[PDB]
């Protein structure tokens, strides 16, 4: 829903964790302002020079423990956005949620990846929230809130990563 637009923006590991993994009131998600990096990522049959940046972060259900009383454990899923340069010709259908963008004869592949973080929080069932699903996150973050044609929306990639050795691997 349009609840996605209401989500605030966070910057830095502890700010993202601090906002989401709140025991008193756990939060569904937040947008992430992050650094763009450049390096090889394997998709399909080979490696592609890929631009990567965090874009969103959301709470994920770990477990529900028994008692005296009913407790709920949450984890943070960090969502990254990628531009796998030249990958769009052979991997246009590799992901359920993806976009293609032409740069001359070259076809870039725009997709999202999720990384589960280690930090967890124990919340009582009375304070528990309904977590967002990976399908909804991809639809709102990439499909509805990012335009590869103009590199704009709720986020944009910093292409200067290609020229920064600190942001290259």
């Amino acid at each position: 829903s349009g609840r996605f637009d209401q989500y605030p923006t966070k910057k830095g590991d502890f700010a993202i964790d601090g906002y989401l993994l709140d025991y008193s009131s756990p939060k569904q998600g937040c947008w992430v302002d992050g650094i763009t990096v450049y390096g090889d990522i394997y998709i399909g049959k080979q490696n592609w020079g890929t631009y990567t940046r965090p874009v969103f972060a959301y709470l994920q259900y770990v477990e529900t423990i028994s008692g005296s009383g009913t407790f709920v454990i949450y984890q943070v899923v960090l969502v990254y956005a990628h531009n796998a340069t030249s990958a769009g010709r052979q991997n246009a259908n590799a992901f359920a949620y993806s976009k293609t963008q032409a740069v001359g004869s070259r076809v870039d592949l725009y997709y999202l990846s999720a990384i589960t973080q280690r930090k967890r929080v124990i919340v009582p069932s009375s304070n528990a929230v309904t977590p967002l699903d990976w399908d909804t996150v991809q639809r709102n973050v990439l499909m509805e809130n990012y335009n590869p044609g103009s590199n704009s929306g709720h986020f944009s990639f910093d292409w200067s990563a290609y020229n920064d050795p600190h942001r290259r691997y």
């Binding site: 592609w48 796998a84 030249s86 990958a87 292409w159 290609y162």
Partner: peptide, 9 residues
């Protein structure tokens, strides 16, 4: 415009 070093096949 995004720069690339990617080599197909």
């Amino acid at each position: 415009q995004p720069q690339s070093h990617s080599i197909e096949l």
